[PDB]
Structures are given as C-alpha cells and as structure tokens.
C-alpha cells in the first residue's frame, strides 16, 4: 500500500538484489564517510565484497574485493550498467556454487576463488544497454 | 622519416618535471602492464643530532604519486600520496596536467621545509608529504583560467 522511495544506486540495489537474488546472503554496506557501497556476499563458508567508490574521494585497495567499480560521485551510475552488474553476477554466483560443490570432493582440486571477467562483464553492460535509454541512478 | 606527436601524459610530464621540478629528484615509472604512470620523488636532508627514527647521517624520504586508469590499472591507494584516475585513452585535461605540476612543486616545497624542521624540532613527532586535494583543485582551476581546455591522451 504506503511504499514510496528516493531512487538511489542503494534503494535500487536493494530492490534489484531481493528480486533477482533472493536465495543469497548478499548483503550491503555503506560506508559514507569513505563514499563507498560494499556488497558483501556469502556462499555456503566463504565470503567477498564487492565496491562502489567514487575515484573522486574514496580510498580503496583493489585488492580486497573481487571487483572495484567507479561511480560519478553525485550523479551516481547507468542503470545500464547496475543491472550489467546484477546479472552478471548471478552469473558469477551460480557459477560460483557449481564449482564450489567441486571443491568438496574433487581431491584434486587445489583453492578455490570467484572469477571475475570484465571483458565478459562489458558484455553484460551491452546485453541489458540495448533494451533502455541512458538512466541515471545517483549516489545517496 | 620523421613524424610528429601531440604531447602525451608520459612525455608531457617528463617534459614538465625538468622544466619545473629540476631542483628536485623526480623518477616516472610506466608501468605498461598496469595502465599506471607513477611520479616517484625523493628529499634529502642531513641528520646532525643523530635524531633516532625508525626503520634506518643523511636521510632519504621517497614517495610516489599514481595515474591510473579505474577500467584497467589495480590499485591500493594507501601505496601513494596521491591516486590520480584519468579517463583511459582520452587522458587528462592539460590543466589537471599542469595543476598537478605546480601544485606538486608546492608540496615538495613545503616538504623540505617540514623535513629540516623535523630533525631539529625534538617536538616534532613525525613526518610526512600533504596533499590537500582543495589545494590542488584550487591549482588545476588558477590554470583552467589561464589557456583553453586541450585533453592530452594516455601513450599507446
Ligand atoms: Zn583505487
């Protein structure tokens, strides 16, 4: 009845991470001192982040997440591309299980870690780029 | 034969470096692989009181300043001073060049002051390089108003 929104990358991600992956515990984080959004994701037990920072004023090391990716500050991000994002992570995530199951019994395998490709995560920005105009979700 | 270029961040900032930043002892580093130019700076200074510091007569500071590109390079910003994203091929605005130049001269400036300061204050704690982003806005925009805008792109 009574729901109504600001429509910010967070709200958006909220919305967009309940209703194409609900079955996770895909969790997320705001750090608004370092203008930075975390979606901090469990598997079942291993856990990564993934960031959102503005190159304009937060302070990250790439390192400590699986993907870092840049938003205009103010303006925020292309819905083009967060939902780009929202895919293809299913597609990292349920990729992901499908090999994490074969860490369990294959003996002969040795770590196991989430695979990140940008070139095919472009494709992504491309795949859902064709179906909208240019949308602009702003940073809270 | 011969051709000519239009400047491009590598050349245009060792260009600069010499013609503004001789006095100093200032490296780049193109670190291909890694779409990541870095500036790497040194200041010197005597230690007399024999002043105890961690880690290590005449001491050495280095520090490093990075270009990166935030589609391609990795980064840890923590590594540097400075992490300056530019906009892949399309490179830097000249005066984000150029307020760089002048504003890291600054910096280096009043370095070397707080370094001298630092082995003969025995109340100064510790030492470091600052860089006030607001200083360095208020650079890029003192030279945004001296010439017209004119991108300078990333090497290939
Ligand atoms: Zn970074």
């Known amino acids: 009845s009574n729901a109504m929104k600001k429509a910010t990358m967070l709200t958006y991600l909220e919305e967009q991470l309940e209703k194409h992956l609900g079955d996770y515990e895909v969790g997320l984080d705001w750090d608004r001192k370092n203008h930075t959004i975390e979606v901090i994701v469990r598997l079942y037990e291993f856990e990564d982040g993934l960031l959102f920072y ?3 004023k937060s302070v990250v090391d790439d390192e400590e ?9 103010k303006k925020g991000l ?34 196991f870690e989430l695979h990140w490709e940008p070139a095919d995560f472009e494709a992504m920005i491309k795949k859902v780029a064709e179906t909208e105009k240019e949308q602009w979700i702003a940073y809270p």
Do not use: C, M, W
């Open 54 to 56: 503005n190159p304009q």
């Open 65 to 73: 997440y699986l993907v870092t990716i840049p938003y205009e500050g």
């Open 78 to 111: 292309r819905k083009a591309v967060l939902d780009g994002f929202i895919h293809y992570l299913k597609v990292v995530l349920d990729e992901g299980q499908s090999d994490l199951l074969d860490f369990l019994s294959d003996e002969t395998a040795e770590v």
